[PDB]
Amino acid sequence: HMCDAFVGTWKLVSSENFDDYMKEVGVGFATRKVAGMAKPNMIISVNGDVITIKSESTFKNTEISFILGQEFDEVTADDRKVKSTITLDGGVLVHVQKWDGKSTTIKRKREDDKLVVECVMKGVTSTRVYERA
Numbered sequence: 001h002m003c004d005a006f007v008g009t010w011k012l013v014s015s016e017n018f019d020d021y022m023k024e025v026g027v028g029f030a031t032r033k034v035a036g037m038a039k040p041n042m043i044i045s046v047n048g049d050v051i052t053i054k055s056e057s058t059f060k061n062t063e064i065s066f067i068l069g070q071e072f073d074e075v076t077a078d079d080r081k082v083k084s085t086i087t088l089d090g091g092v093l094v095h096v097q098k099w100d101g102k103s104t105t106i107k108r109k110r111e112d113d114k115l116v117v118e119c120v121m122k123g124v125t126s127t128r129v130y131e132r133a
């Protein structure tokens, strides 16, 4: 019942600072433009200890499955090959991606009827708000 309030189908409704976040991560111009247009659906499900998070959009479809605290390999939508670990910290899903000596953290939180996604790379944050589909 660890992630009960996260489970479901969620649609992106607002974004702030995402272009700058992608620049900080190292995403190139054309990918930033096309990725920034996308309005993905994020689909979160749980089966036993295994959490699955899918992102589906016109730009890319991604899927990760994982156990909390257990590192895994991920290919991001921008084609980074990263080592990821996802934990629950005080009811917040905290997703750290490591690659090429760099790191970024993505936090996912339930706030009112929204799922808020905060993406941080160095001093640059983007906030992406999802609502139930």
Ligand SMILES: C[C@@H](CC(=O)O)Sc1ccc(Cl)cc1
Binding pocket: 022, 027, 031, 035, 055, 076, 077, 078, 106, 117, 119, 128
């Ligand atoms: C958490 C991701 C954003 C989200 O799911 O709303 S971060 C990310 C996504 C796409 C690219 Cl092209 C780069 C980074």
